[PDB]
Amino acid sequence: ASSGNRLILTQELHTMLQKHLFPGDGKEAAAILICNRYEGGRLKLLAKELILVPYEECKSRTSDFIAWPGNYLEKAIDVAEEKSMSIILIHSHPGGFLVFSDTADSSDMQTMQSLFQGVDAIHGSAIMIHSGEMRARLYREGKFAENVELVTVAGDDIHYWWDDKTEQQLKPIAFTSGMTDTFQKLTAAIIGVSGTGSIVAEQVARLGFGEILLIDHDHIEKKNLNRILNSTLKDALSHRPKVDMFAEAIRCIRGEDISRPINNTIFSREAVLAAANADVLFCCVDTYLARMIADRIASSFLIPLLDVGVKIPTHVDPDDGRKITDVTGRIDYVKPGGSTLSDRLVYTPELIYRENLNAPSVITLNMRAASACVSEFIARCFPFREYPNKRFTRTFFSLAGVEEDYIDESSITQALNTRLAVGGEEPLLGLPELGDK
Amino acid sequence: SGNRLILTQELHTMLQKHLFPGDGKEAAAILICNRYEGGRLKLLAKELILVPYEECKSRTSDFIAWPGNYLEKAIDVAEEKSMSIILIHSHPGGFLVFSDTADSSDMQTMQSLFQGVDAIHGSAIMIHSGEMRARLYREGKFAENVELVTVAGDDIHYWWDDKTEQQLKPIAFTSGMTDTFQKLTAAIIGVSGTGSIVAEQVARLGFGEILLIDHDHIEKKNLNRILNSTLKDALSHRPKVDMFAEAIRCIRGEDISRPINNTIFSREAVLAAANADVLFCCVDTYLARMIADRIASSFLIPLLDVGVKIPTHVDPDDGRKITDVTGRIDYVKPGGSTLSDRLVYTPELIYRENLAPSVITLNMRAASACVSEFIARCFPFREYPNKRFTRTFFSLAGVEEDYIDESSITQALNTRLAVGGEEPLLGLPELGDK
Ligand code: NA
Ligand code: NA
């Protein structure tokens, strides 16, 4: 679950690619995906640019073959040369093809060697079927090496196309052992082992996730024994780090070294580069800085993001004295290429600036929010609602007003997303404080 | 081991009205109570005798002389089952009992009560706002104060003997909430997918004693749901109550959890749960919910019942599908509508019972709302009366949530109210003392 490689496409790229590869005439088509890479605990290919080969530019197109010109390999190499990007050829299901110049044709093998000669990097060849599922093979030194373990698109719904898929195996439904089998192959990152984060982490561990990253610098103490799952008085009296405490708890619960404690703030190279390995991010730190870092990790490394927060404002009523003003929670799902936490004003530059220049809490509210947060991931991997998951991109609930509201992704304005799929380009996350010094 | 005097909301409303008619003069009443003598003494208000003003010789702002034939009538009511008799007077509380021939002071009257019925008796005072304080008398002589007088209505009221006058009621989610919980006992029926989450919250909210009732064990198949369970617990088939009680001991650094390794349908479980100040029912069986129902009414304990369901169906095209994903939270106050009234169970369903996946996210969603409900009723923080939220139904598949007011629920006659441990226990001969 930790070292399997991945090819990640954005929903918007995948939709364009699927339309191009399946126009409706049942004939093969061709396209080229240019990808950045993350190479930490695993190889992750990050789809960045898409070149569609126009049908009229192809010498021929049939139900099981296509011939397209080699100038398109040159166009892909032009895009990839500077940053040694990975180049993935993609064809409609059957996948037979050749690349022709004026003088010579190149087989699939010859074309992959040609790609390597133009750009020293891992390249690949991928196939898509009409439904959109994708399989991919990687070429090292221009030669066939290994299949991609997982091709994934995290859109409104989240799709996992595994290399070991069974032919007559239907997708599992939510809350079943087939859900567990999926999660067992995935890595989850919990940013903040907090009131909400310890609960998200607990659910993630017991749901069967295969690797669980825990990122937090804080420690157990008497004041948070009312909230932090698995914490003990002995932990508090020694100020045991939260990540070490919870990592030990997970190893006892699951009986295996699946927890990865990161004793640091998310605003660190250690944390960012660990988190980049994850297949899903849960942000549970109640600071504007933390949510922005989580936001930028999600976009840069194409990781779906679930951000959760709760608030209990209070005020002094002239008659009764102090009063609970409201009891609220918020869940935000962010897909790569969809609206960001910034777009949603979960943070702003001014709020982060004022935060870095310079309130009751309760387990019941934390659990109410954390349960909804992990349920949102389940619903998007294994749809079970009567409405499209897109309708529930944002969730706002109030236990005092006893109301719950949902915001559709389509209602949210999107700014230009410059960091999408840039991976670990320095300065990391565009922040000099995280850059290689 | 802190004693308690528990009144139903209906009896307290009636008592408050009688003691404060609006003329500012004292009034007198007599509460006849059954008892539960377990870890703590619990006085269960059963009958209330209101002394008519017109039959009182004198009623003033700080004194009342009322006839003693009512003391004799209360003794008659209490004689058969040696019920406890609590005299109640309006705030100031000065009084005398007069016959046709003699007057008796408060001390003499308390001694007369003990001569008429060999049992614990008491004398109580209510202020206009409804708060109550009480003193118990043993062998007709002053003994100890009542640590807690409580009424679990739509709002739950705790009137502590150690109350400070300038001190204000705490608000939800504060240390003053913890201070209240530290004095209370909570019983969790079922350390289940929901029950382990309820118990976890109850422990970390600071409850003083936590009773855990369950006969089931940790297994590999429930390591995906039972909080604090470990692979070692599954290997050793560890009783859920023992597992969680040990967890609580380490979490709190204090042995505050009592493991009852048995089914709720047992004398051991019923008699243990009767000590609790609040019942959380988290067993998904009709029998368990009926037993919890009858404990709540018999021993005047507020009850929170929680259940979740994930129906599935086979769609012709897609195959197996999730039909719905639902949760239910029911708050039951003593003398309010019961789980039976709400059709949470029926006699037919229990008979057939003793003749659908699950997931931690749904369990946690329901268990969190369940415990939040108790907090809201002890420390109101909502923008509408708590009565509006007597029942909660939510669907995560339809993405809807609905709330049912107590006033929408028709009630049957409630005959077990405050009967305590009258045999056969809970009216079930299978739970009687052979
Ligand atoms: Na976008
Ligand atoms: Na009733």
Collect all residues of chain B within an 8 Å Cβ-Cβ radius of residue A363: 200-201, 204-205
Return all residues near A370 (Cβ < 8 A) that are at least 6 apart: A196, A197, A199, A200, A203, A284, A308, B364
- Spatial strand order in the sheet of A6-9: A143-147, A134-140, A123-128, A86-92, A30-39, A43-52, A6-9, A150-154, A158-162
Distance CA B24, CA B60 (A): 8
The half-sphere exposure of B281 on its side-chain side, counting CA atoms within 13 A, is 30
- Could you write out the three-class secondary structure of chain B? CCCEEEECHHHHHHHHHHHCCCCCCCCEEEEEEEEEECCCEEEEEEEEEECCHHHCCEEECCEEEEECHHHHHHHHHHHCCCCEEEEEEECCCCEEEECCCCEECHHHHHHHHHHHCCCCEEEEEECCCCCEEEEEEECCEEEEECCEEEEECCCEEEEECCCCCCCCCCCCCCHHHHHHHCCCEEEEECCCCCHHHHHHHHHHHCCCEEEEECCCECCHHHCCCCCCCCHHHHHCCCEHHHHHHHHHHHHHCCCCEEEECCCCCCHHHHHHHCCCCEEEECCCCHHHHHHHHHHHHHCCCCEEEEEEECCEEEECCCEEEECCCEEEEEEECCCCCCCCCCCCCCHHHHHHHCCCCCCHHHHHHHHHHHHHHHHHHHCCCCCCCHHHHCEEEEECCCCEEEEECHHHCCCCCCCCCCCCCCCCHHHCHHHCCC
Buried b / exposed e over A110-125, threshold 16 CB at 10 Å, is ebbbbbbebbebbbbb
Omega before residue B424 within 30° of 0, cis: yes
Q: How many domains does chain A have?
A: 2
Nearest to B173 among A234, A362, A384 (CB): A362
Residues B274 and B138 in one domain: no
**Within an 8 Å CB–CB cutoff, is residue B317 touching chain A?**
no
Distance CA A306, CA A283 (A): 6
Distance CA B270, CA B263 (A): 9
Residues B286 and B342 in one domain: yes
**Within an 8 Å CB–CB cutoff, is residue A315 touching chain B?**
no
In a domain, B170, yes or no: no
- Tokens 């050749």 found at: A98
Distance CA B316, CA B231 (A): 39
Nearest to B365 among A323, A365, A371 (CB): A371
Collect residues with CB below 5 Å from ion ligand 2.
B 335, 411, 414
Sign of the CA dihedral running B281, B286, B292, B296: positive
What does each C-alpha distance from B393 to A267, A371, B184 come to in angstroms?
Answer: 41, 17, 28
Nearest to A207 among B321, B360, B401 (CB): B360
The half-sphere exposure of A402 on its side-chain side, counting CA atoms within 13 A, is 20
Breaks in chain A, named by the residue before each, with C–N above 2.5 Å?
358
Nearest to residue B420, comparing CAs of B43, B2, B39? Answer: B43
CB proximity under 8 Å: A 237-296 to B: 252-255
**Within an 8 Å CB–CB cutoff, is residue B368 touching chain A?**
yes
Taking the CA of residue B342 and the nearest CA in chain A, the distance in Å comes to 22
In a domain, A130, yes or no: yes
Q: Token digits for A436?
A: 């290689």
Question: Does residue B137 contact residue B122 with C-beta atoms inside 8 Å?
Answer: yes
Q: Which DSSP letter does residue A113 get?
A: H
Beta-bridged to residue A138, according to DSSP, are A124, A146
Collect all residues of chain B within an 8 Å Cβ-Cβ radius of residue A207: 224, 359-361
Question: Coil, helix or strand for A384?
Answer: coil
Return all residues near B103 (Cβ < 8 A) that are at least 6 apart: B65, B96, B97
Nearest to residue A23, comparing CAs of A56, A59, A71? Answer: A56
Collect all residues of chain A within an 8 Å Cβ-Cβ radius of residue B356: none
Question: Coil, helix or strand for A299?
Answer: helix
State the angle between helix axes of A177-184 and A363-381 in degrees (0 to 180), rounded to the nearest 10: 90
In a domain, B167, yes or no: no
Residues A138 and A260 in one domain: no
In a domain, A157, yes or no: yes
Q: Of B160, B185, B207, which residue is a domain's last?
A: B160
Question: Coil, helix or strand for A314?
Answer: strand
**Within an 8 Å CB–CB cutoff, is residue A198 touching chain B?**
no
Distance CA A150, CA A280 (A): 14
In a domain, A172, yes or no: no
- Tokens 């204090």 found at: B254
Beta-bridged to residue A330, according to DSSP, are A309, A396
Nearest to residue A245, comparing CAs of A214, A210, A222? Answer: A214
The half-sphere exposure of B220 on its side-chain side, counting CA atoms within 13 A, is 2
Taking the CA of residue B350 and the nearest CA in chain A, the distance in Å comes to 28
Residues B183 and B153 in one domain: no
Helix or strand (DSSP H, E) at A317: strand A314-317
Q: How many helices (H) and strands (E) does chain A have?
A: 11, 23
Chain B residue with minimum CA distance to A205 = B224
**Within an 8 Å CB–CB cutoff, is residue A323 touching chain B?**
yes
Distance CA A171, CA B40 (A): 56
Omega before residue A427 within 30° of 0, cis: yes
Distance CA A60, CA A279 (A): 39
In a domain, A170, yes or no: no
Ranges of H-type helices in A125-265? 177-184, 197-206, 233-238, 242-254
What is the signed CA dihedral for B274, B275, B281, B287, rounded to 10 degrees?
-20
Distance CA A410, CA A273 (A): 31
CB contact under 8 A, A206 and B223: yes
Q: Token digits for B132?
A: 């109550």
Question: Does residue B283 contact residue B289 with C-beta atoms inside 8 Å?
Answer: yes
Cα-flanking dihedrals φ and ψ of residue B334, to 5°?
-60, 120
Whose atoms come closest to the Cα of A416: which ligand? 1
Collect all residues of chain A within an 8 Å Cβ-Cβ radius of residue B227: 202, 229
**Within an 8 Å CB–CB cutoff, is residue A311 touching chain B?**
no
Helix or strand (DSSP H, E) at A372: helix A363-381
CB proximity under 8 Å: B 74-113 to A: none
Residues A148 and A240 in one domain: no
What does each C-alpha distance from A216 to A193, A271, A275 come to in angstroms?
Answer: 6, 9, 12
Chain A residue with minimum CA distance to B326 = A385
Q: Token digits for A363?
A: 């387990």
Cα–ligand 2 centroid distance for B338 (angstroms): 8
Nearest to residue B30, comparing CAs of B104, B82, B87, B75? Answer: B87
For chain B, the straight-line distance linking the first and the last C-alpha, in angstroms and rounded, comes to 28
Taking the CA of residue B263 and the nearest CA in chain A, the distance in Å comes to 26
Nearest to residue B224, comparing CAs of B193, B262, B248, B264? Answer: B193
CATH number at residue B282: 3.40.50.720
Q: Of B137, B160, B183, which residue is a domain's last?
A: B160
Q: Identify from A200, A308, A367 which residue to disrupt to test chain B contact, counting B C-beta atoms within 10 A and taking the largest count.
A: A367
**Within an 8 Å CB–CB cutoff, is residue B28 touching chain A?**
no
Residues A29 and A119 in one domain: yes
Taking the CA of residue A175 and the nearest CA in chain B, the distance in Å comes to 6
Question: Coil, helix or strand for A54?
Answer: coil
Q: How many residues are recorded in chain A? A: 437
Collect all residues of chain B within an 8 Å Cβ-Cβ radius of residue A387: 399
Cα–ligand 2 centroid distance for A230 (angstroms): 41
Residues A21 and A56 in one domain: yes
What does each C-alpha distance from B7 to A245, B45, B131, B135, B354 come to in angstroms?
Answer: 45, 5, 12, 15, 35
Question: Does residue A122 contact residue A138 with C-beta atoms inside 8 Å?
Answer: yes
Return all residues near A327 (Cβ < 8 A) that are at least 6 apart: A310, A311, A312, A365, A398, A399, A400, B381
Collect all residues of chain A within an 8 Å Cβ-Cβ radius of residue B178: 226
Distance CA B124, CA A194 (A): 47
**Within an 8 Å CB–CB cutoff, is residue A404 touching chain B?**
yes
Residues B152 and B40 in one domain: yes
Taking the CA of residue A253 and the nearest CA in chain B, the distance in Å comes to 4
Collect all residues of chain B within an 8 Å Cβ-Cβ radius of residue A235: none
- Tokens 């939270």 found at: B329
Ranges of H-type helices in A55-173? 71-80, 108-118
What does each C-alpha distance from B394 to A199, B329, B362 come to in angstroms?
Answer: 21, 9, 11
Chain A residue with minimum CA distance to B372 = A364
Rg (CA), chain B: 24
Q: Token digits for B75?
A: 């003794």
Helix or strand (DSSP H, E) at A366: helix A363-381
Parallel/antiparallel/unpaired status of strands A86-92 and A123-128 = parallel
Distance CA A18, CA A173 (A): 25
Residues A62 and A183 in one domain: no
Chain B residue with minimum CA distance to A377 = B361
Q: To 5 degrees, how large is the angle CA B323–CA B324–CA B325?
A: 145
Question: Coil, helix or strand for A84?
Answer: coil
Residues A134 and A183 in one domain: no
- Chain centroid to Cα A42, Å, comes to 14
**Within an 8 Å CB–CB cutoff, is residue B221 touching chain A?**
no
**Within an 8 Å CB–CB cutoff, is residue B128 touching chain A?**
no
Cα–ligand 1 centroid distance for A122 (angstroms): 27
In a domain, A58, yes or no: yes
Q: Token digits for A43?
A: 């190889």
Question: Does residue A218 contact residue A227 with C-beta atoms inside 8 Å?
Answer: no
Cα-flanking dihedrals φ and ψ of residue A300, to 5°?
-65, -35
Collect all residues of chain B within an 8 Å Cβ-Cβ radius of residue A202: 227, 360
Q: Which amino acid is at B301?
A: I
How deeply is A402 buried, as exposed, middle or buried, from its count of CB atoms within 10 A (0-12, 13-18, 19+)? middle
Q: Token digits for A384?
A: 């079970």
How deeply is B430 buried, as exposed, middle or buried, from its count of CB atoms within 10 A (0-12, 13-18, 19+)? exposed
Helix or strand (DSSP H, E) at A21: helix A11-21
Residues B18 and B81 in one domain: yes
Ranges of H-type helices in A276-359? 288-301, 349-357
Question: Does residue A21 contact residue A29 with C-beta atoms inside 8 Å?
Answer: yes
Q: Token digits for A6?
A: 């991945």
Parallel/antiparallel/unpaired status of strands A403-407 and B28-37 = unpaired
CB contact under 8 A, B381 and A324: yes
Chain A residue with minimum CA distance to B314 = A173
- Tokens 């990839």 found at: A80
Question: Does residue B85 contact residue B110 with C-beta atoms inside 8 Å?
Answer: no
CB contact under 8 A, A253 and B232: no
CATH number at residue B88: 3.40.140.10
Return all residues near B292 (Cβ < 8 A) that are at least 6 apart: B189, B264, B273, B279, B281, B283, B303, B305, B339
Whose atoms come closest to the Cα of B8: which ligand? 2
Distance CA B333, CA B337 (A): 7
Structural domain range at position A99: 6-162
Question: Coil, helix or strand for A363?
Answer: helix
- Tokens 């009511």 found at: B77
Collect all residues of chain B within an 8 Å Cβ-Cβ radius of residue A196: none
Whose atoms come closest to the Cα of A336: which ligand? 1
Taking the CA of residue B274 and the nearest CA in chain A, the distance in Å comes to 25
Nearest to residue B200, comparing CAs of B222, B225, B224? Answer: B225
Q: Of B160, B187, B205, which residue is a domain's last?
A: B160
CB contact under 8 A, A229 and B231: no
Taking the CA of residue A372 and the nearest CA in chain B, the distance in Å comes to 7
Q: Identify from B167, B173, B205 which residue to disrupt to test chain A contact, counting A C-beta atoms within 10 A and taking the largest count.
A: B173
Q: To 5 degrees, how large is the angle CA A81–CA A83–CA A85?
A: 75
In a domain, A56, yes or no: yes
Residues A379 and A300 in one domain: yes
Cα–ligand 1 centroid distance for A151 (angstroms): 20
Nearest to residue B323, comparing CAs of A418, A33, A386? Answer: A386
Chain B residue with minimum CA distance to A236 = B251
Resolution of the solved structure (Å): 2.0
CB contact under 8 A, B230 and A207: no
